[model samples]
Target: EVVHFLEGVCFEKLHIEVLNENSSHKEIRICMPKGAVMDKHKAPGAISVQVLEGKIVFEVGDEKIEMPKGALISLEAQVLHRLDALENSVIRLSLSK
Candidate 1:
């Protein structure tokens, strides 16, 4: 097991890759431990997040949205947002320039 719990533990964002050279599409994988969070952030471009497993809470403006497995959310560029992991989960994020 990984003993990485620290103050303000954040979600693990990993396995980033570019699917093709001709396109601006890139993929980022995220893993979140139950109770971990991603503080308010903004994407560099338009982004789409597809929940691969478990559940996550998305905070945008004054709304809090819960996404379960297979749920997807899309956002335009520069949108400020935040996330809270309701449980251990995995997510796939697609980005476009």
Candidate 2:
């Protein structure tokens, strides 16, 4: 149902929706062009990531995990990680405190 939220977006962009501020939950949508790299960063809280379309390499320190569409991955709070888009991609992130 949330997939449609990506409608009309065709270029690299980031979209965020604070679904339930009281609960500290949010929805994040990111569109990355091929070869795009999101440098290592720490999350404010625990996060769940789902690849809505295309593919990416999820990097955490010395390891790289390949994630394709429909892949679900989770990260602990404050974990350092980065994403490398293997193709033009659409990714959704759910975060909670």
Candidate 3:
């Protein structure tokens, strides 16, 4: 269950949709504007980044990945990463535990 709301520092916010009780995956849609940044952080588990539209710059460790339309990125567990872009960017980030 979604117990509370977690505040983040950026021009973006993570809206998580909780499925049914039998759900094994949590869906997270991170909406951001230009210059929106999610500082380098580590995921508790493996995560996948699917770029439905627009462009985003994903920095995973020392590797910088450029994701455009129809792009999907699968990141390993506990990897430090950050997402940022100069222009308007939107992405759907899913984390599986």
Candidate that scores best on lDDT:
2
lDDT of 3 by residue, 8-63 (tens): 32344433343222255566656567767777767788888877556888897678
Model 2 backbone overlap count: 0
The whole-model C-alpha lDDT of candidate 3 against the native structure comes to 0.66
User: Which ranges in model 1 have alpha carbons more than 4 Å from their true place?
Assistant: 1-22
lDDT order of candidates, best first?
2, 1, 3
TM-score between candidate 2 and the true structure: 0.82
The estimated TM-scores of all candidates read 0.76, 0.82, 0.73
Residues 1-97 of candidate 1 have per-residue lDDT tens digits of 2222222333454223333333676666667877878877788999998887779999898999999988999999989988788987777777887
After superposition, the stretches of candidate 2 with alpha carbons farther than 4 Å from their true spots are: 1-3, 12-22
What's the lDDT for all of these models? 0.73, 0.78, 0.66
Displacement of the residue 18 alpha carbon in candidate 1, Å:
7.1
| Candidate 2, 49-76: lDDT as tens digits | 8898889999887999999999999988
